[PDB]
Write a protein that binds this ligand. Structure first.
Ligand SMILES: Nc1nc2c(ncn2[C@H]2C[C@H](O)[C@@H](COP(=O)(O)O)O2)c(=O)[nH]1
Ligand SMILES: Nc1nc2c(ncn2[C@H]2C[C@H](O)[C@@H](COP(=O)(O)O)O2)c(=O)[nH]1
Ligand SMILES: [Mg+2]
Ligand SMILES: [Mg+2]
Lengths: 196, 196
């Protein structure tokens, strides 16, 4: 009876943060070692760059902390079509659920404008900003972060791992479901939740 | 056993939106009719000003849509002391839960900076921005809005009505609890929830 509610993450799922960070890094520090997308491992890019050479952590962070960085991210392939499709499904409710940087200054505002410009004013109404996704109530959370924790020990949602460069090689127990891309069958996953 | 989680609203509860709007209106439109705080009725100020005279709705909105308006709000009396006290209580979890304007441009960013400057970086981590509070999981919601609705028919929280100029004369059924101000016994209300 109930509609199925789907929480959809922003960076790594709708907005291509990883491609935008690499392109920004190579343009600004053309002389420096970089991490090709295929070689990304672990959720935080600055930690990987820092393991390469300590000062590069600060350098890569200066890219995502710049004015215009979040504003100008390109969409993830197929994301805008899929989210429009999903939003029009009957008895289906969509929210966009995103964690801003602690350096919020050029992040929070740019994220609202990104959604307005790439999706539309109607989607702006459905943004939730939070540093703890476990306190948001939904049936599914589609998110590229490997392991999501916070104050609620047993969240109401099932986490569906959205495949991204940094989690592609990650081994998951059979109980954890993945979405390989927006061409994978996210429609069937929604139906599995309705059925329970 | 569980900690008690308290969602605390921003405008009308921590930040004095109503006093800041009136002061801004009288300074910018000194020649126009105004609504004294004591005479405020109903949640939306622009609707009341619009009922006074149609063009005044647009004029009052121009105040809260200005750069610097959210940034510079004064705190509600006793709010900063009480939220610090509450946050240090054992087995008690606090989040700040706020709805931004659909005209987000000078609202979203200013709200983050308000919390940093009036409360501290630690409180910035606990902001949730949403247009639907019913999908946020907590035990209590302390909020000045008369009636809170959204997609979840039976929210997990009990709404505690925080008294404000615009809701002071509102008659509520005996089942609805009010907080008269931050000098009223919010500590006992938290204990009532722990007990269940
Ligand atoms: N500190 C830090 N934050 C990062 C890094 N990469 C991405 N982020 C932040 C940027 C976004 O605001 C936030 C996205 O979180 P999420 O909503 O779970 O996709 O993650 C990084 O390398 N270091
Ligand atoms: N459109 C409109 N919005 C208002 C008015 N007064 C306050 N607001 C908005 C400003 C805040 O972003 C939002 C606060 O909602 P809340 O989180 O429930 O306290 O309410 C008004 O008169 N008209
Ligand atoms: Mg993400
Ligand atoms: Mg309020």
């Amino acid at each position: 009876k109930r509609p199925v509610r789907v929480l959809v993450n922003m960076d790594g799922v709708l907005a291509d943060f990883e491609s935008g960070l690499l392109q920004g890094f190579r343009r600004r520090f053309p002389e420096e070692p970089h991490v090709p997308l295929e070689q990304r491992r672990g959720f935080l890019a600055n930690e990987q760059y820092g393991a390469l050479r300590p000062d590069l952590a600060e350098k890569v962070a200066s890219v995502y902390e710049s004015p215009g960085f979040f504003l100008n991210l390109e969409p993830i392939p197929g994301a805008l079509d899929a989210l429009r499709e999903m939003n029009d499904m009957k008895d289906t409710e969509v929210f966009i659920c995103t964690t801003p940087l602690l350096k919020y200054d050029h992040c929070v505002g740019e994220k609202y404008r990104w959604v307005e410009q790439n999706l539309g004013p109607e989607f702006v109404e459905r943004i939730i900003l939070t540093r703890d996704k476990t306190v948001v109530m939904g049936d599914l959370l589609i998110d590229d972060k490997d392991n999501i924790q916070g104050l609620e020990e047993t969240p109401s949602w099932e986490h569906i791992l959205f495949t991204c460069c940094h989690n592609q090689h990650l081994a998951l127990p059979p109980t954890r479901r993945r979405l390989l891309s927006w061409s994978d069958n996210w429609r069937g996953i929604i139906e599995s939740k309705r059925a329970s």
